[PDB]
């Protein structure tokens, strides 16, 4: 089934691989070659996760596929000692990368720019930082995070407290600022569009004049219809990127407590006062 | 366990607060998915998707809400999904043939997909009445009538660093194949959005110098060497860009005709764009 | 900024994120080098208490081992001064210098910890050099934070907080953590031991939590550790989820409290004015006074066995639970 | 140039300077009272 | 230097001078309060 | 000097002056509350 | 080689937009509006004018009083040194009352200034709420922005007022400082046993991460369909252009379901405000009806169990 | 002094004065409540 306007858009072309062979839709999903791959990768990784779950516990929150011991270095591990995690990592990476390449096939077919696959490549960059880049720099795949709903929260807790106060990480304070600011911007953007198209009952749908006037009335500046989506993309992508920066520098480029990092600020010759 | 919050030997207040939020989150998710089904619904199940070989309508889950009335500024209560758009889409005879009869097979255009509105060249059925501002002015108008706008946000930047505050008037336009399509004669601005939207050009390079054509700004790469490079379509293809009904106004429909034509170039402008990398 | 390579060690189960990351290029490698022990001189003949006019601590040592100990202590605490750092010129039976009385207390303390605190130091023990490292003063002592008797109607009352301090490892955390726990015996537990609240039985404030946090900031940087080496921070108050380092450092807290309350603070009365801190207090021992940023002080070198005289007798009164933990029998009246 | 004239601006200026005179005189008295209560310029020996 | 006002906009320059001098005067006074020998409200010996 | 009121809107100048005086008076009063000698509500002796 | 809709290449400047006319009782707007080339690259170039009414002025006055109290107490803590203020700028704070005062009014220098700063800050944000509400109503808009702001207010009040009041002490609240309120955030989690195991903190993060996910998805989609004037989203809601169809088809083909030009802003609006609402509820639950969140998670079978890797420590004081 | 109302808008001066005095009255009353000598509700000795 299709949206009542969808038929005319379902044309041939836009693929990067596979050509006509996979260029079709199953229900609403466009398939493409990267959809077949993202399906094989996703099913493989999910079924491997459930196998790992069957060996410890089926409780959804307590399922955990953990990375190997640090003593393994970069070697591939036995399956039940983190080798299962490593296969799931290469399956998830492939699932993410083929998902973005597939969104690139969908982008070209609808004549859209590649903003969505690239914006997703930032999210893939952050996961790659967590499971590939940072474990590489530190020298062991065991530095990646476990695949479990509650077991990866203990990883975040302990890795954060490896630096004794992770709030003082300068790149983390920047990434948190970008995360808080982008949901603030999302609240304003979503709210303002709803406020115009859904005014008080008995009022006409308003214009982009009212949108600019509203924020110029409130804060004295309005970024506009186009600016809100550039800034919205900018804030969320910087949120992802500075997440990657904050974690890649935690351990490969800083092994002490993050509060100590601010010792350079306390020592600036301008304001030492002693 | 014991203490403040215990509701039974196992249940506590935080846990039941959580399940209370689960019920709300579901009702919100269902509500949000219904708001999702006010454009393009009900789904058109074609005959070649169903074992009974009859076209049908699928509501999906959750089913779409009742029609929604947007009262408009000019005094016109429009209903969503709009009846005229649905009626246009279901009755339009596409100039394309499915590459296979089964459901999900892509359409392969028969004639010229760019002028026939196939795929990335497609247009929606929109209003033919040109938009107005809240005050009644013409919303999208060229700078020759919208004379209160001058090109260049900063006069000093436009005068001393014109590269970053350009004025594309008089610029040559090149297509994806590097050929010269013509010269930019005017800029169209949205009085509400306070932005350029179209670069009107003549066809002095590939047609009549007296002909006028609109180039959407998001398809134009205004360079630093007084040349505007359009990657969407070949220079020879600027001649078939849809013309305005009136030389000084554009309806929302013609915006979908013009941006649609350039968007179609992304696949059909030159051979091989449809073809994969490998 | 730092760079790879970094030394990594696993402290907990794979995937828990319990790891230690260290920069090998940040280690001093000279501060932690144990001095080469002298040759074992004879332990024959009459004891020191029979030879010397004024000896109260090293009575049961031979004459040879007494002089070997005296020369070793000179290298450990005042190599650039000589024997006259503590002794009044040529009159070695004189106790006039304050350094002489302090060093006599320092020998009694060095003997005490080496005989009673294997619950923390195991077999390594300590030597004058573990704290002094060749200096007249341990580089890593602490003074009490000044208490200024705030206006109560003025402005800017930091409640020992809100200033970057090297005590708190450059956090805005409470700066009086040493006074509360390394000299006083205030409670360090912050986590309720129940699922549901009992606010009238357990109501630790966030200020008390940040004070215990600030002591943990120090205990991490003071031993070159982090929160993960003693904890699974997901379950912070679970002892069975913690490495054995937590149990060892538990006694390190009570031993440091023992050193400060019973051996260092009694010396405050007779110190010179130049030595005292802003409050007028004596420099006190923290975790880094022995560790200097390494888990094993002096690379875990066992120096005590080489020098008879720094080991005392295992006290019958020792408990390690009588320092603010169900009793205060191992602490004097003052503390702080 | 604001809508004020030379005559209007002169009128505002005179009243403004008179308002500055009254406001400053009240402050000066408030400073003579404050000095009588507790002086704020310490001597070489302090307070 | 009356020609300076054919370069610098005098209305904006006057306002920014008052704003700038407000920050500087407050800053200098605050610096003197922080010193021991020039905090007039504390009254330490000189 | 009267020509200042042709350069600026007098309403704006007054609002700016008063807004400044209000903050300045509050900063000064808070400063005196900080010191021992001039904290009048605290009532500490000399 | 295609234009990426990241910076506006060609800009056009006209007269300053004075805004839509207000009802004949509102204060006049300010007269100050200028155009910025730098801001015009990202979006609308006009800066100002701004409205200021009863609620706006009183919100600013209450907020300035709060900022002056915090700033002067911060400056007083470093002995009034502007240099030491810059050196300690992230570390200084207006400290909340000590625990011994409970919910009573403590002396100024023992949390009294904090309580006044918290009261005036609360008043300014509440008046700012009324300002956002009235500016929308004055234009005939819905009050969605104000209620989304009210949702952020509720977490702010839950953290600083309601939860400390439910706990019976102003000490539980958060100091006005940069690193100190980060110290409060960490200590809060330490005290009540790993806020990670708080389910409403989990949900809060779900909607926070989903908000960044949504804005990244939506912002990228509007820029990608900018060739079809997607960013003119109001026109697409009332008159579905091809951009609205390509945006919906893009996500329908990707993840099997889509939104509309209007429903996407309902998804993002609810994700933004649910993040801050589950945040407030999670804060109100801890300390009051949950003592230790890890022990709560153990009770409800959500804590992972870890095999032996080390010799477990034993509490000597057991 | 009625000429003040030909400069300042009496309508918006009245609103401003009322909201300004509201902020100051709460501030002062709360400052006094936070002193031992003038918290009339705690009633500490004078
Ligand atoms: C709170 C936080 C925690 C919770 C988070 C959420 C939990 C985890 C995520 C779960 C969310 C996703 C779940 C559903 C995924 C979407 C699938 C879908 O279509 O949704 C339809 C559904 C609406 O249904 P509909 O599209 O109206 O259905 C209309 C007809 O049924 C339409 O009829 P039709 O003709 O389309 O029928 C199709 C039928 C016909 O099947 C055939 O005949 C096949 C024959 C081929 C030979 O079957 C199919 O063809 C499709 C089956 C799947 C095919 C997959 C193949 C993909 C290939 C590779 C691509 C990569 C993927 O949309 C949703 O409910 C999904 C969103 C709900 C969750 C939102 C996110 C929540 C986040 C909370 C925070
Ligand atoms: C303690 C935690 C709670 C503390 C809350 C304190 C802070 C309160 C702020 C939170 C609400 C912010 C969002 C409300 C909102 O949408 O405002 C727009 C809306 C704009 O109004 P307007 O300008 O007159 O609209 C003109 C047109 O009608 C244009 O209007 P429209 O068409 O755009 O608006 C229609 C809107 C209607 O929106 C509303 O009427 C407000 C939403 C109603 C529920 C709000 C509760 C949210 C907080 C609790 C959620 C978690 C609780 C879970 C359990 C405890 C844990 O659509 C909805 O129905 C949205 C609700 C989703 C469907 C209902 C889902 C419930 C089913 C599951 C339960 C049964 C199983 O503002 C309101 O209608 C007033 C909301 C007042 C809420 C007070 C609470
Ligand atoms: C005690 C622990 C420390 C701490 C330790 C850490 C550690 C360790 C980390 C963070 C990271 C983050 N911290 Mg922190 N952090 C702390 C407290 C906070 C607080 C707070 C309330 O105080 C906040 C707001 C934050 C905020 C943040 C973010 C800036 C960042 C996580 C976002 C991110 O990485 O996106 C990136 C998003 C992803 C990586 C998701 C990947 C998406 C992939 C590509 C697609 C997946 C698809 C999926 C499989 C589909 C499912 C299937 C379908 C649904 C069917 N932290 C405390 C102080 N923090 C993390 C970070 O920055 O890493 C990059 C990180 O590693
Ligand atoms: C960088 C800015 C933010 C962002 C952006 C972003 N995310 C995106 C996109 C963009 C622009 C998409 O276009 C893409 C999308 O289409 O979303 C609908 C997507 C997406 N982001 C998603 C999730 C997601 N994004 C997150 C974060 C973020 N996304 C950032 C905050 C998170 C977090 C913070 O946790 C999650 C969970 C998906 C909904 C979707 C990508 C779907 C995808 O890649 O599907 C591939 C196939 C699968 C079924 C995936 C599973 C296959 C694996 C083999 C199994 C699972 C392995 C995994 C390691 C398990 C880990 C579990 C434990 C952690 C519990
Ligand atoms: C959905 C939840 C998210 C959210 C939403 C949200 N926030 C919001 C809103 C919404 C919907 C608003 O409408 C409102 C707003 O104004 O948005 C622009 C706001 C807002 N969120 C803000 C902050 C904020 N939001 C945050 C978070 C969040 N906001 C959530 C993540 C945070 C974080 C992460 O901590 C912060 C810090 C404000 C910028 C704004 C509300 C401002 C406010 O209440 O101000 C009150 C008044 C004052 C503070 C007075 C002092 C201000 C000036 C110093 C006065 C200047 C005086 C004079 C005019 C000039 C003097 C100088 C002279 C020299 C000229
Ligand atoms: C000297 O400085 C000058 C004057 C020059 C100006 C400079 C000012 C500066 C630099 C200020 C700096 C400020 C900074 C950096 C502030 C940092 C603030 C932060 C990070 C705050 C973060 C969190 C704080 C929170 C969440 C506070 C919450 C408090 C609340 C919600 C209080 C509520 C209190 C109420 C409602 C009061 C009730 C009082 C009643 C009446 C109930 O009591 C009986
Ligand atoms: C750590 C627990 C220590 C051990 C073991 C020993 N000493 Fe010590 N000593 C220690 C401290 C913290 C201080 C105070 C330093 C200060 O800044 O005030 C001292 C002081 C002395 C002194 C006095 C030095 C002076 O004031 O000039 C002497 C003479 C001294 N210590 C000697 C000494 C000897 C001989 C030790 C071994 C037997 C010894 N100390 C061990 C901390 C510690
Ligand atoms: C070993 C050297 C430790 C390091 C490094 C850290 N901690 Fe610790 N912590 C340690 C011990 C022995 C104890 C028990 C103290 C006692 O006398 O009972 C603790 C206790 C805590 C607590 C209190 C938890 C409770 O029992 O209720 C907290 C909150 C805590 N530790 C936190 C903490 C953090 C955040 C650390 C990293 C910066 C950290 N600790 C390091 C031993 C050691
Ligand atoms: C401080 C750290 C000391 C240094 C350096 C040296 N000596 Fe010492 N010496 C010290 C103390 C505290 C004592 C008292 C011994 C006790 O147990 O109470 C001594 C004692 C002696 C003696 C005995 C003298 C007597 O009692 O009659 C001698 C002979 C002696 N010391 C010699 C000595 C020499 C030769 C040193 C230089 C190498 C030397 N001491 C350094 C403390 C300290
Ligand atoms: C550039 C850094 O690149 C990264 O450097 C570090 C250290 O050099 C390497 O790490 C390597 O040395 C460390 C030293 O402790 C070993 O424990 C680790 O097993 C090994 O892989 C990474 O494998 C490499 O990818
Ligand atoms: C903004 C620029 C910040 C630069 C900080 C450099 C700090 C260098 C020492 C620590 C490293 O890491
Ligand atoms: Fe949008
Ligand atoms: Mg604090």
CSV table of C-alpha atoms and ligand atoms in Angstrom, one decimal, chain A residues 180-181 183-184 187-188 215 218-219, chain E residues 19, chain G residues 59-64 67 121 124-125 128 132 145-146 148-149 151-152 208 272-273 275-276, ligand 5:
chain,number,residue,atom,x,y,z
A,180,UNK,CA,20.4,20.8,26.3
A,181,UNK,CA,20.3,23.6,23.8
A,183,UNK,CA,16.1,20.1,23.0
A,184,UNK,CA,15.4,23.7,24.0
A,187,UNK,CA,10.8,22.7,22.1
A,188,UNK,CA,10.7,26.2,20.7
A,215,UNK,CA,10.5,35.5,19.0
A,218,UNK,CA,10.2,37.4,23.4
A,219,UNK,CA,14.0,37.4,23.1
E,19,UNK,CA,29.4,51.9,29.6
G,59,UNK,CA,10.7,39.3,35.1
G,60,UNK,CA,13.9,41.3,34.1
G,61,UNK,CA,13.9,43.1,37.5
G,62,UNK,CA,13.4,39.9,39.5
G,63,UNK,CA,16.1,38.2,37.4
G,64,UNK,CA,18.6,41.1,37.7
G,67,UNK,CA,21.9,37.7,39.2
G,121,UNK,CA,14.9,33.6,40.1
G,124,UNK,CA,11.5,35.9,37.0
G,125,UNK,CA,11.1,32.6,35.2
G,128,UNK,CA,8.8,35.1,31.8
G,132,UNK,CA,5.8,34.0,26.6
G,145,UNK,CA,5.9,27.6,23.5
G,146,UNK,CA,4.8,28.8,26.9
G,148,UNK,CA,6.8,23.8,26.7
G,149,UNK,CA,8.6,26.4,28.8
G,151,UNK,CA,7.5,22.0,31.4
G,152,UNK,CA,11.1,23.2,31.7
G,208,UNK,CA,16.6,13.9,25.6
G,272,UNK,CA,11.4,18.0,24.3
G,273,UNK,CA,8.8,18.4,27.1
G,275,UNK,CA,12.4,14.8,28.6
G,276,UNK,CA,12.0,17.6,31.2
I,5,LIG,C1,11.6,21.4,26.8
I,5,LIG,C2,12.6,21.6,27.9
I,5,LIG,C3,13.8,22.4,27.5
I,5,LIG,C4,13.6,23.9,27.5
I,5,LIG,C5,12.5,24.6,26.9
I,5,LIG,C6,12.3,26.0,26.9
I,5,LIG,N1,13.1,26.9,27.5
I,5,LIG,C7,12.7,28.1,27.3
I,5,LIG,C8,11.5,28.1,26.6
I,5,LIG,C9,11.3,26.7,26.3
I,5,LIG,C10,10.1,26.2,25.6
I,5,LIG,C11,11.0,29.5,26.4
I,5,LIG,O1,10.0,29.8,25.8
I,5,LIG,C12,12.0,30.4,27.1
I,5,LIG,C13,12.6,31.3,26.1
I,5,LIG,O2,12.7,32.5,26.3
I,5,LIG,O3,13.1,30.7,25.1
I,5,LIG,C14,13.9,31.5,24.1
I,5,LIG,C15,13.1,29.5,27.7
I,5,LIG,C16,14.2,29.8,28.3
I,5,LIG,N2,15.1,28.9,28.8
I,5,LIG,C17,16.2,29.5,29.2
I,5,LIG,C18,17.3,28.9,29.8
I,5,LIG,C19,17.5,27.5,29.9
I,5,LIG,N3,16.6,26.5,29.4
I,5,LIG,C20,17.2,25.3,29.7
I,5,LIG,C21,16.6,24.0,29.4
I,5,LIG,C22,15.4,23.7,28.7
I,5,LIG,N4,14.6,24.6,28.1
I,5,LIG,C23,15.0,22.3,28.5
I,5,LIG,C24,16.1,21.3,28.0
I,5,LIG,C25,18.4,25.5,30.4
I,5,LIG,C26,19.3,24.5,31.0
I,5,LIG,C27,19.7,23.4,30.1
I,5,LIG,O4,19.7,24.6,32.1
I,5,LIG,C28,18.6,26.9,30.5
I,5,LIG,C29,19.7,27.6,31.2
I,5,LIG,C30,16.1,31.0,29.1
I,5,LIG,C31,17.2,31.6,28.1
I,5,LIG,C32,14.7,31.2,28.6
I,5,LIG,C33,13.8,31.9,29.7
I,5,LIG,C34,14.5,33.1,30.3
I,5,LIG,C35,14.0,33.6,31.6
I,5,LIG,O5,13.2,33.0,32.2
I,5,LIG,O6,14.6,34.7,32.0
I,5,LIG,C36,14.1,35.3,33.2
I,5,LIG,C37,14.7,36.7,33.4
I,5,LIG,C38,15.9,36.9,33.7
I,5,LIG,C39,16.9,35.8,33.9
I,5,LIG,C40,16.4,38.3,33.9
I,5,LIG,C41,17.8,38.5,33.6
I,5,LIG,C42,18.1,38.7,32.1
I,5,LIG,C43,19.0,39.8,31.6
I,5,LIG,C44,20.3,39.8,32.3
I,5,LIG,C45,18.3,41.2,31.8
I,5,LIG,C46,18.8,42.3,31.0
I,5,LIG,C47,18.4,43.7,31.5
I,5,LIG,C48,18.3,44.8,30.4
I,5,LIG,C49,17.2,44.5,29.4
I,5,LIG,C50,19.7,45.0,29.7
I,5,LIG,C51,20.8,45.4,30.6
I,5,LIG,C52,22.1,45.8,29.9
I,5,LIG,C53,22.3,47.2,29.3
I,5,LIG,C54,23.8,47.5,29.2
I,5,LIG,C55,21.5,47.4,28.0
